[PDB]
C-alpha cells in the first residue's frame, strides 16, 4: 500500500510538471502581436 | 463514556483542528459525508467520546470553531470534512482582534467570549461523564492566544475538576511571523501556568527541521505540519477510543508526568517518522521505535534535551507488541544513559500499549517527555520581553486601550521565578 | 469585510484609474460593470442584478480630469455621484485648497461617504490617494482627514502619499505645501506609505528598462503594490493578513508613522524567459535600495520592523528560511530594541498582468514595507530646503493673501525640527 | 487499454519510476514467501518450487519477445493494482470589450488604460476565491443567550 | 552472533568497499534487489555478521558510507548492487577537503564527525554483542585518511573493549599520485600506533606487479585491484561466515601474531592467482598453494620478506582439506629457511581451515605474516618527510589552518622510534 | 559543485566566446539556450528548458559586447549580465584602475554577489585577463583585489597571457604588466600563464596552420581549460578538482606561477598517421615544443608537476610512464619534493568542434608543472620595464591621471624580491 501510494504521488508530480511547461510555453505569444499593432499606431501618428 | 469536546481558535488553531478531525474521522472509518463506513466493528463502540448520533448513522463532531475573521470558517468548511461541523457551534464575531493581546482579551472578548461559553456549556451538559477538555490554539496571535486564554480562566473557573489539554505553537527567532511574539506569548504563559493543567508546547522550526531532515520532503507546506500535529493528538487519546492490554487515560498521565503543580510543560515527538525512500529498507521492532524516540532531533520542539535533565517521561504505543521487551527496552535507555534522566525519581518513564494501529503502519508510538531543558526557550523568551520592554517598544497600543504595565511586571517575574525552579529541580 | 478607497488631487484619481483597471482586468468583470454570463464584495458593492460600483469618490477641483475620467471608457462603472467635483482649481497653494475652497467642497465628500460607509457592513478602514507636491492633495485632503479623524477615529485610514524628489521637482512652492500638509498628517493619519517619483523613475529606467516611461507605468505600478497589499483581504491564503495588521505590526510609536514600500520582482518581458524564479533571489531583490519605491539610503538607517507581503506559489520554509539568511547577514542591521523585525504573509493568487503593460507575468511576487530612519534624512533635506527660501520670505505674500500669517509656518517648522529630534533619539 | 499505452509510452521512454522498481521487488519478496510457506522454512527450497514453477509453464507461440514480456509485466501489475475556473475566465469571448473610440490625431493620455483587448493566456490560470455564502447566511453578531437549564444528573456510579 | 560493521572512507575506499560488497553478495546469494536467490541453506546461518532483517527477508549490508565528493556517491549508485545500502547510511558533506590532511582532521570533521559517530551507534545498538569494526581507506588522501584518522580516534575513545581492523593503501615513491603524500602518510602513521588495534598494508605497486606477473593482463583497470583487495577481505572474515575444522576469529588471529602491542602491521598474500591460460595447466594441491603463498612476489606490499626476519606468520585456508598435510607443509616451510624466521620464538605460523571455499574455485588461501622488513618502507616514507620538512615545503596549508610544527616533530619522532624498535626486533 | 568564470578585457571576452561555444558543444545545448546534472557547474537551470552560463563579460570599449550580443548566441546569456563601459582605459593601468574603475566595478560586484547566491556549493572563482591591455589589467586588479576582500579563501584561478618577449602589441605594456603583477602576487591564488608566441609555433609545427588567427588560441585555451575542468564536470577513474591546485602546486605563499600544457595537439591528416597511446603523449608533454609559454625548463628545476588525463587512460601505465620520466635524466627536479607529479584520469576524451582544427582523438594530456623559468621571464620582462622607466618615458600619462612615482618605486623593488626569491628556491 505504501509503495502504491508513493507511486501515485511521483506520477501526480510529473503530471503538474508537464502542464506547467505547457503553460510555460503559451504565454509567450502574446507580445510580437501587440509589438506589431504599436507599429501600425504610430505610422498612423506620423502620417497624419 | 468518558467525553472530550474540541476547541479552536485563530487560523493557526482552526486549520490543525480541522486536520485533525479529518485524521480521526478517517480513523473511525466514517466518510466526509457524515456515515459510517467501516469494516471492524471495534469503531463503533467509542465514538461517543468524539461524536454524537444525529440522524441514522449521521456523526457530527463535538466541536466549537472561534475566530473573528470569516475566512477562517471559509477555509475549514471549503475543504474535506469540513460539512461535518455543526452550524450552530461555529460563534463567530465580525471586527478582528488582529495580533493583539490586550484586544483579544478585553475589547472583542466581552461581547464574543459569552456566546461561546454559552454553546460549549450546551455542549458540555449534553452528554453524560466528562473526561476533560480539548484546546487548540497559538500564542503569537490576537483571536488565538487571548481569547483563548481567557476561555481557559472561564472553563477552569467553571469546571475545576475537570481536566484541560491546550496545543500551543510558540514563537522562535528562526521562524518569527509577528513582531509582537514576545508580548502576547509572556502574557498567555503567565496566565496559563495558574489555569491550565498541562499543555503541549510546538513550534514550526521542529516542524520545519523534522520534515527537512526525517521526511526529506520537497515543499512541506502547512497541510503535512498539521498532519503530524494531528498524528500527536490522535495518538495521545487513543487509549480511550481503544482496548489494550495497560491503558493509560488522559488523568493517569497527566498523574503520571506532573510531580509539582507548575511543573506542567510538555515537549511531544512521534514515531515512526521515515522517508519515502528509506521505509523498505527500515526494520519494524520496538528497539527501533525506542531508538527513534529518544533522539534529540526527533522531538517536536526547539529545546535540545541534552541541554538539560528529563523529570518524567511517558510513551503510548499501539499495535500488536510484547510488554516484556517495552519494559525492557526503557529500563535499558534509563540505565545507558542515566545522567540525562532526574536522580531521586527512580523509573522516570511511564509506559502504556495500545491494540490498534493507525492505519498503514503496522506498528506507531507517542513521545511525552517533561523535561526541565524547556527553560531555555523561556528564557529566550523573557530576554526579549525585556529588551522590547526596557524603552517600552509597541507598548501604548496595549496602555491606550486599557492594559497597564504593571501586569507586565507580574508576567516577566511570573516567567523569571518559573524558569528559575526550573534550573532549581536540574 | 470591506474597504472604501479616496482620490484627492490630480494624481490621486490618476492612481485609481489605474488601479480601478486593474481590479477590474483582476476580477473579470467587463469596463461597462456587469457579469458576463465573490471576493469583488470588498471592493464593489452589487447593485440590482449583474452590476458592480466601486466603493470610491474622486474628488478635485479643476474639472478638466475629472469630466475626462467621466468621458473616459468607465462611464458606466463609476457612480455619477461618487466623482465630486469643484469650481476653480488650488493652484498650488495649501491655503487655498484648506481654507477657502475646501469650506464648501468637503461637506459633500462627508456626507457621500457617510452613506457610503452606511452602505458597508464590515468596514475594516479607509485608504487614501495624494499628492503633497500640490495645494488640492494637500489642503483640501488634509482637512478631508481630519474631519474623518474626528468622525470615526478608531478606523485605520491608510495614507499613500507622493512626497516631491530632492532633485527631480516639478513645482516651487512645494516644499511649503509639504511642510504643511505633515503639520497635519502627523497627528492625523494612523498609517502613512512613503512613495517618491524618482525612484520609480530610476526603477523603469534600469529595470523595467523603458528609456521613455511617463506617468501611466508609474500609476500602473503603484496599482501593482496596492493590489499585491490587498490580496490578503480579497483572496484565501495560507497565511493572510487584513488592513489592521500594520497598525500595530509596522508602527512602533504613536508619531512615527512612514514606512518604506518596495515591490520585487521588477522584470520586464523578456529578462523572464532567461531568469528564475524563486523566493531567495525576490527576497534578497527587496532590500536593496535599487529596487526602494522612496529614493533614500537605507544603508544609513536602522530597520524598525519590516512586513513581508506574498502572491503566488510560495511556501512557507522556504521564505522562512531566507528570513533567517536576511537575518544572518551583517549588511542590513536592525534596532536594538526589537530582535525580530519581521512580519510575513502569504496569499495563493499570483499577481495578474495587464494587457498593454511591460511588466511581465510573474509566479510569485514580494511586496515589502518596512520601517527606517532613511526618513529621518528624508524630511530634515526637504526641511533644509523648505528654510532656504523660507528664510527671505518668498511666496508668502500669496499665502498671507489668502488669510494665514506666519505662525503656522513657524509652528510647522517647529514641529519637523521636534520630529527630526524624535528620529535622531529613536535611531539610538 | 488506456493504462497498457501509458505504461508502454513510459518503458519506451526509460520512464520507470523508483517506487515501480520497489514495488516489483516487494512482489518478488511476497512470492519467495508463499514459496516458503509452500515448501517450508527453507529459502532454497523456495527459490526452487520458485523455478520448476516458471519452467512448467508451456510456451505460447510469438512474433517477438520484448513486446511480450512487457505485455505479461503491465498484466501482472494490472491484476495486482490500477497504476495508469468561472466561465468568464475560462473563455474571453464571453466579455464584451465594446471600448470608447477615439479621434486617431486627437489621442489623451488617460486613455491607454481601458483600450486593450485582453487574451485567454492574459486570464489567470486558478482562481481560488472565496464563498462566503456560509457567512453570509449568518444572524447578526448579536447573538444572546436565552436558555432555561434542563440538564439530567448523570452522577458517576 | 558475532557482528562486523562497515564504514568506507574517500574515493578509493567506497570503491573498494563496493566491490567488496559486490562479492560478499554473490558468495551469499544476494542479488542486487536485497533478495535470497541462492541454492544451500548453509548461506543463511551466518549473515548476521554483515546484514540485518528489513522487512521479509530483505537484506541490507551493515555499513556506512562517509566521503565528500558526490560524484563518489554517483559512481557508487551507478554500478550494480548500489541500491542495497540504506540511504539513511549515506552521511556526506558538502566541501571536500581535498588533499589535505589538516582540513579533514580539523575543519570539515569538526561538524560532520557528530553525524557520523551518530550513524555509527545508531548501527552498533542495533546489534547484541560487537566482534570488530571495518574500516577500508588510504594514508595518501586528505579527505579519507584524516577523517578516518579522527573516527578511528573517536570510536577508540567510545568502544575500547572491541576489536579493529583498518585498511590502508599506502603510496610508494614508484606509484606516486600527489604531491603531500609523506605528511599525510607520517601523520596518519601516527595516530594509527596508538589508535589502531592492527592494519592490513596495502599497496598499488604490488598489485600492478602481481596483474602484470601472475594475472598477465595488459588494462588492470581500477576494478581489478579492488577485486583482489575484495577477495582478500572476504578470505580474511571466512571463518566467522562458515564452520571450519579449525577455526580461527579475528580475535584469535590478532591475539597470535601481534607480540608486542605496537606491532600491528602486516602483509598481504593470497592465493591461487594465476592467469587464464596457465590455469589449465596448474593443479590443486597444498604443497603448489603453499609455495604461492610464500612467494615473495605475491606480497601486496613494497617490501621483500626476504630482506628481513619473519616474527610471526598466518595461514587462513578455505575447502575441504587435509589437516596433517596443511601442518607438514608449515613445519618444511618454517626448517628448510629457518633464517627468515626470528629466534626466540618457534613455531612462526598460526594455520587454520575453513570448509567452505569461496565460489568458482575449489581451493583458496590467504596469507598475513607479520615481518620486520616491513620497517624499510618506513624509511622510504620518512626520508621524504624528512627532505620535506627541511626547507618547509608545502606547510603554509597546514600551518595557516591551525596546526603547528610540533606534531610534525612528534610524528618524526613517533616514526623513527618505531623503526628503532623493529631493527631492535630484527 | 559550481563555478564562475568572469572575463576581463579585449582577450578575455573572445577567450569566453571559445569556451561557452565549447562547453554548449559538449554538453548538447543549443544555441537557443535548452537541451533538445552534469552541466549544473557552468549553467543554471532556469524555469523550465532554458540554460544560463554562469558567467559575465565586463569590458569599457563595448563593441565586442554589442558583437557577442548581436552573434548566434544572443539568447544564450542573460541581456544584463554583459557589463559594457562607455569609454575605454585606452592601455592606461592608471586610468583602468582610478578613473575609469572607481565607477564600474560596484556593478560587477553587485552582480557577482547574486550570481553566487543563485550559487549553493561555489568551488571558487576563475578570472581571464591579458595583462598587457588596459582594462585587462587596470580594473582587474581592483576586481580581485575587493573579491579577496569580500571572500578571500575562496579559490581564485588567474588565467593570464603574459606579452611575448620579442612579440608585442603595444608599447607601454611592460608598465601594465609590472603594475598588474604588483597586485597578482598577493591577490589571485593559483596563476597560469599563457603566451601568444609559443600558440603560434605550436600551430605553426603541430597544426601546419601558416595564417592563423585568435580564433585558433582561443579555441586551444579553451580546449585547455576544458581539459581542467571535464574532472568537476563528469566523474572518472580519478577525480581532481580545483582546491587540489592549492594545496599541491603552490610549495609558497609567493611563489604562485604555473607553466601549462597540453597533448596532443595533432591535426586530422596527421592524427590517421601517428598511434595514439601514453607513453608517446606524456613524452609530449615536457618538450619546450609544445609549453604556450615561450621558456626553458631546461635552464630550470620542476618543483612539482600536474597531470590531466581524458579519455581511454588507465592508472598502470600512466604510472609506468612517470616512473620512466623519474627516472630520465634529461630533466631534474628540486632536492625538496621527490615526488613532484601529481595525475589525473576521467573517462570522457575531449571532444571536437566543426570549423576547429583537433581531430577526434582518443586521448589526451594537459600538464601543469612549476619551475624557475618563471624567474628568468620575470627578469627578462624587467630589464626592459626599468630600460622604459630610466627615461621617465610615458610617465607623464600616469602622473596626469592622478599617480605619482612612488608605487612605481616599489613595483620594481617587488620584482626584485620576486627575484630574490625566485634565485633562493633554486637552490
Ligand atoms: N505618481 C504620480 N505623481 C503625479 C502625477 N501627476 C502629478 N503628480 C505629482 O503631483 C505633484 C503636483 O500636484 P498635481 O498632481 O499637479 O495636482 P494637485 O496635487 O491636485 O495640486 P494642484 O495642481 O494645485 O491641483 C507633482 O509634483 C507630481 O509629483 C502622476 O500622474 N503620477
Ligand atoms: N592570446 C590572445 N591574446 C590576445 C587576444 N586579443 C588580445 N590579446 C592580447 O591582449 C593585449 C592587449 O589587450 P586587449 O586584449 O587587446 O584589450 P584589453 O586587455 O581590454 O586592453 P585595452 O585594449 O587597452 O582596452 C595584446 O597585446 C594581445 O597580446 C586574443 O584573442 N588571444
Ligand atoms: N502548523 C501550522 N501553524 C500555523 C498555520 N498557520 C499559522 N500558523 C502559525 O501561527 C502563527 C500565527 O498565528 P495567527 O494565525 O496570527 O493567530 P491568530 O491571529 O490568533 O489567528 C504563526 O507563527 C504560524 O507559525 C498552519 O496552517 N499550520
Ligand atoms: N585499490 C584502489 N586504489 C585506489 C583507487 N583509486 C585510488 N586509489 C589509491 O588511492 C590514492 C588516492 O587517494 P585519494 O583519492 O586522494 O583519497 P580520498 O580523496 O580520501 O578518496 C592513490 O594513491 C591510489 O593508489 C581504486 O579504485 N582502487
Ligand atoms: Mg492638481
Ligand atoms: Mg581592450
Not at chain 2, 458540555?124 to 488565538?144: K, M, N, R
Not at chain 3, 523603458?210 to 503603484?222: G, K
Request: charged share 20%; with cysteine.
Amino acid at each position: 500500500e505504501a509503495l502504491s501510494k508513493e507511486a501515485a504521488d511521483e506520477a501526480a508530480e510529473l503530471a503538474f510538471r508537464e502542464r506547467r511547461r505547457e503553460e510555460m510555453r503559451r504565454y509567450r505569444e502574446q507580445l510580437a502581436l501587440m509589438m506589431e499593432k504599436e507599429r501600425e499606431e504610430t505610422a498612423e501618428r506620423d502620417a497624419l | 463514556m468518558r467525553e472530550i469536546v474540541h476547541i479552536q481558535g485563530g487560523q493557526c488553531g482552526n486549520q490543525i483542528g480541522a486536520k485533525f478531525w479529518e485524521v480521526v474521522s478517517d480513523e473511525h472509518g466514517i466518510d466526509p459525508t457524515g456515515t459510517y463506513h467501516g469494516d471492524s466493528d471495534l469503531q463503533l463502540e467509542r465514538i461517543n467520546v468524539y461524536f454524537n448520533e444525529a440522524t441514522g448513522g449521521r456523526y457530527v463532531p463535538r466541536a466549537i470553531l472561534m475566530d473573528l475573521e470569516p475566512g477562517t470558517m471559509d477555509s475549514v468548511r471549503s475543504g474535506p470534512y469540513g460539512q461535518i461541523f455543526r452550524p450552530d457551534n461555529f460563534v463567530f464575531g465580525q471586527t478582528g482582534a488582529g495580533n493583539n493581546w490586550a484586544k483579544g482579551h478585553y475589547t472583542e472578548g466581552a461581547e464574543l467570549i459569552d456566546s461561546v461559553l454559552d454553546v460549549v456549556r450546551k455542549e458540555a451538559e449534553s452528554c453524560d461523564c466528562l473526561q476533560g477538555f480539548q484546546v487548540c490554539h497559538s500564542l503569537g496571535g490576537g483571536t488565538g492566544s487571548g481569547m483563548g486564554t481567557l476561555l481557559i480562566s472561564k472553563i477552569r473557573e467553571e469546571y475545576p475538576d475537570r481536566m484541560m489539554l491546550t496545543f500551543s505553537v510558540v514563537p522562535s527567532p528562526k521562524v518569527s511571523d509577528t513582531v509582537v511574539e514576545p508580548y502576547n506569548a509572556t502574557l498567555s504563559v503567565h496566565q496559563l501556568v495558574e489555569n491550565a493543567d498541562e499543555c503541549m508546547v510546538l513550534d514550526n522550526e521542529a516542524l520545519y527541521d523534522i520534515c527537512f531532515r526525517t521526511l526529506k520532503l520537497t515543499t512541506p507546506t502547512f497541510g503535512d505540519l498539521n498532519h503530524l500535529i494531528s498524528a500527536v493528538m490522535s495518538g495521545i487519546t487513543c487509549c480511550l477510543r481503544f482496548p489494550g492490554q495497560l491503558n493509560a487515560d488522559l488523568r493517569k498521565l497527566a498523574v503520571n508526568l506532573i510531580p509539582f503543580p507548575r511543573l506542567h510543560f510538555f515537549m511531544v515527538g512521534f514515531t515512526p517518522l521515515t522517508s519515502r525512500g528509506s521505509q523498505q529498507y527500515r526494520a519494524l521492532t520496538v528497539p527501533e521505535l525506542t531508538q527513534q524516540m529518544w533522539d534529540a532531533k526527533n522531538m517536536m520542539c526547539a529545546a535540545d534535551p541534552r541541554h538539560g535533565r528529563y523529570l518524567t517521561a511517558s510513551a503510548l504505543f499501539r499495535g500488536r507488541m510484547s510488554t516484556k521487551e517495552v519494559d525492557e527496552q526503557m529500563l535499558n535507555v534509563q540505565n545507558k544513559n542515566s545522567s540525562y534522566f532526574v536522580e531521586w525519581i527512580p523509573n522516570n518513564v511511564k509506559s502504556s500499549v495500545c491494540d490498534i494501529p493507525p492505519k498503514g503502519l503496522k506498528m506507531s508510538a507517542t513521545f511525552i517527555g517533561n523535561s526541565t531543558a524547556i527553560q531555555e526557550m523561556f528564557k529566550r523568551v523573557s530576554e526579549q520581553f525585556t529588551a522590547m520592554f526596557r524603552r517600552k517598544a509597541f507598548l501604548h497600543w496595549y496602555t491606550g486601550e486599557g492594559m497597564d504595565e504593571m501586569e507586565f511586571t507580574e508576567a516577566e517575574s511570573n516567567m523569571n521565578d518559573l524558569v528559575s525552579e526550573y534550573q532549581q529541580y536540574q | 469585510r470591506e474597504v472604501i478607497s479616496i482620490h484627492i488631487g490630480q494624481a490621486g484619481i490618476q492612481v485609481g484609474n489605474a488601479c480601478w483597471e486593474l481590479y477590474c482586468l483582476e476580477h473579470g468583470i467587463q469596463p461597462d460593470g456587469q457579469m458576463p454570463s465573490d471576493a469583488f464584495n470588498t471592493f464593489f458593492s452589487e447593485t440590482g442584478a449583474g452590476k458592480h460600483v466601486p466603493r470610491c469618490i474622486f474628488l478635485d477641483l479643476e474639472p478638466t480630469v475629472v469630466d475626462e475620467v467621466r468621458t473616459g471608457t468607465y462611464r458606466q462603472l463609476f457612480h455619477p455621484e461618487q466623482l465630486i467635483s469643484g469650481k476653480e482649481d488650488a493652484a498650488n497653494n495649501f491655503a487655498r485648497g484648506h481654507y477657502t475652497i475646501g469650506k464648501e467642497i468637503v461637506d459633500l465628500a462627508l456626507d457621500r461617504i457617510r452613506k457610503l460607509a452606511d452602505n458597508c457592513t464590515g468596514l475594516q478602514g479607509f485608504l487614501v490617494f495624494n499628492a503633497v507636491g500640490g495645494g488640492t492633495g494637500s489642503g483640501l485632503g488634509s482637512l478631508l482627514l481630519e474631519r474623518l479623524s474626528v468622525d470615526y477615529g478608531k478606523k485605520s485610514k491608510l495614507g499613500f502619499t507622493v512626497y516631491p524628489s530632492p532633485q527631480v521637482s516639478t513645482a516651487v512652492v512645494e516644499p511649503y505645501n509639504s511642510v504643511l500638509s505633515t503639520h497635519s498628517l502627523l497627528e492625523h493619519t494612523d498609517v502613512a506609505v512613503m512613495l517618491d517619483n524618482e525612484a520609480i523613475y530610476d526603477i523603469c529606467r534600469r529595470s523595467l528598462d523603458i528609456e521613455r516611461p511617463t506617468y501611466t507605468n508609474l500609476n500602473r505600478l503603484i496599482a501593482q503594490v496596492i493590489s499585491s497589499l490587498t490580496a490578503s483581504l480579497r483572496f484565501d491564503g495560507a497565511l493572510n493578513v487584513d488592513i489592521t495588521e500594520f497598525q500595530t505590526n509596522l508602527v512602533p510609536y504613536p508619531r512615527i508613522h512612514f514606512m518604506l514600500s518596495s515591490y520585487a520582482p521588477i522584470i520586464s518581458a523578456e529578462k523572464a524567459y532567461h531568469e528564475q524564479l524563486s523566493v531567495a533571489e525576490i527576497t534578497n531583490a527587496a532590500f536593496e535600495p535599487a529596487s526602494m519605491m522612496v529614493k533614500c539610503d537605507p544603508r544609513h538607517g536602522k530597520y524598525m520592523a519590516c512586513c513581508l507581503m506574498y502572491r503566488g506559489d510560495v511556501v512557507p520554509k522556504d521564505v522562512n528560511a531566507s528570513v533567517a539568511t536576511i537575518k544572518t547577514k551583517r549588511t542590513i542591521q536592525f534596532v536594538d530594541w526589537c530582535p525580530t523585525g519581521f512580519k510575513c504573509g502569504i496569499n495563493y493568487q499570483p499577481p495578474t498582468v495587464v494587457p498593454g503593460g511591460d511588466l511581465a507575468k510573474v509566479q510569485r511576487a514580494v511586496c515589502m514595507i518596512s520601517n527606517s530612519t532613511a526618513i529621518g534624512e528624508i524630511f530634515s533635506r526637504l526641511d533644509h530646503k523648505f528654510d532656504l527660501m523660507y528664510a527671505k520670505r518668498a511666496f508668502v505674500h500669496w499665502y498671507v493673501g489668502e488669510g494665514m500669517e506666519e505662525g503656522e509656518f513657524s509652528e510647522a517648522r517647529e514641529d519637523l525640527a521636534a520630529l527630526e529630534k524624535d528620529f535622531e533619539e529613536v535611531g539610538a | 487499454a488506456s493504462n497498457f499505452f501509458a505504461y508502454y509510452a513510459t518503458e519506451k521512454a526509460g520512464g520507470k519510476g523508483e517506487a515501480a522498481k520497489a514495488l516489483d521487488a516487494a512482489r518478488r519478496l511476497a512470492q519467495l514467501n508463499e514459496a516458503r510457506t509452500m515448501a517450508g522454512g527453507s529459502l532454497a527450497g523456495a527459490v526452487k518450487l520458485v523455478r520448476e514453477v516458471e519452467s512448467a509453464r508451456p510456451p505460447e507461440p510469438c512474433v517477438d519477445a520484448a513486446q511480450r514480456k512487457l505485455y505479461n509485466a503491465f498484466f501482472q501489475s494490472w491484476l495486482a493494482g490500477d497504476r495508469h475556473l468561472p466561465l468568464r475566465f475560462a473563455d474571453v469571448t464571453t466579455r464584451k470589450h465594446n471600448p470608447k473610440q477615439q479621434h486617431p490625431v486627437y489621442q489623451t493620455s488617460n486613455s491607454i488604460y481601458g483600450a486593450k483587448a485582453p487574451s485567454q493566456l492574459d486570464m489567470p490560470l486558478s482562481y481560488s476565491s472565496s464563498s462566503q455564502a456560509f457567512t453570509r447566511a449568518f444572524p447578526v453578531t448579536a447573538a444572546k443567550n436565552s436558555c432555561m437549564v434542563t440538564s439530567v444528573t448523570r452522577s458517576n456510579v
